[model samples]
Target: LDAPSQIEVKDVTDTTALITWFKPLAEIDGIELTYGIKDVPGDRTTIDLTEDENQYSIGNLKPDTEYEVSLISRRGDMSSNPAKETFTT
Candidate 1:
């Protein structure tokens, strides 16, 4: 399998958000995540995780706002679909 995994958000706060996910359907050569406010727009960034890596944290968010998070897995071009989550500050 080469599909993206389910992403989850935890330990939410005004300026920080913690995220985790099960591994992808297939062994992904690499993984990336892009997250931001659902109602607001800002910079987009990617994270590279080792196979054993299970979670990540996003910082520098404005307090007391809702953010929408999504992820993508990269094998060669791109695989499967994206996962999303919403959190409040």
Candidate 2:
């Protein structure tokens, strides 16, 4: 009940990338994401998705910049390790 999977990055444009992750374990109560441009660590955002919610948009990105992304899942006081990916704007 502590594992996460199906992490993906897509919809690369000049300004945004769509990020999605799957929570196979129903024990996951929510998710958090941190992303930024190129080599920079972007800001952190959190989502309160239930078991049926799976996708999110990482918006307001600079045009044509490379982005690195990471995700975390949480249940109560426990959090999963960060899952990471990279994409271009």
Candidate 3:
């Protein structure tokens, strides 16, 4: 199945982070939230959310920093390609 569509970001600011997306067409177990400070591979973080949810408040972000947040659809052992929405804080 396809990854989450209409991916978007909002409430941007220093220490501000949030995202939302339309769920995939197929039923899924959850979503894999992978994000990090832009170009800083070692600073990445991951989170898990249930299928019922579509929005997340990704807190504790750094100010004046750039970031990349990807919402990956998860179904059993399979994961959709981690497409993303990038923004500056």
Candidate 4:
């Protein structure tokens, strides 16, 4: 699959953020999402998404903290370049 594009931060609150992105240029089997506090090592979380899903809610985040998030398109054993975004919650 091609890389995700048109990424957007839909909404944010004290402990969560809503993120959305467009599908890849080619067909994709699924998606893998990774996120964590910005600049903090070993604090990341990852999730696998079904093919039809394009939006995700990043929960259990600290209030008033900054985070870095990425979405990668997956096809079989291959992965596309990540669509990255930063937000504060």
Candidate whose lDDT is highest: 3
Candidate lDDT values, in order: 0.73, 0.71, 0.87, 0.86
TM-score of each: 0.80, 0.78, 0.93, 0.92
Candidate 1 vs candidate 2, lDDT winner: 1
Summarize candidate 2's per-residue lDDT along 1-89 as a digit string, tens digits: 35459888888778767877777565777776667765754444545566566777766778877777777777888887877888877
Q: Which stretches of candidate 2 lie above 4 Å from their native place?
A: 42-51
Please give the TM-score that candidate 3 achieves against the real structure: 0.93
Clashing pairs in 3: none
Q: Give the candidates in order of TM-score, highest first.
A: 3, 4, 1, 2
- Candidate 1 segments whose C-alpha is farther than 4 A from its true place: none
Model 1: per-residue Cα lDDT at residue 26: 77
Ranking by lDDT: 3, 4, 1, 2
Return whichever of 1 and 3 wins on lDDT.
3
Predicted structure 4: lDDT = 0.86
Q: Candidate 4 lDDT, tens digit per residue, 1-89?
A: 68778888767989888888887878888889899998898888989998889889877889999899988899998998777889888
Q: Among all windows of ten consecutive residues in candidate 4, which has the lowest summed lDDT? A: 1-10
Kindly list the per-residue Cα lDDT of model 3 for residues 1-89, writing each as its tens digit: 57999888998878877798998999999999888987998987888999999988877888899999878899988988888878998
* Each model's Cα RMSD: 2.0, 2.2, 0.9, 1.0
lDDT of 1 by residue, 1-89 (tens): 34456677888888998898888767777666777778766645657666567788888888988778777776777555766777887
The TM-score measured for candidate 4 stands at 0.92
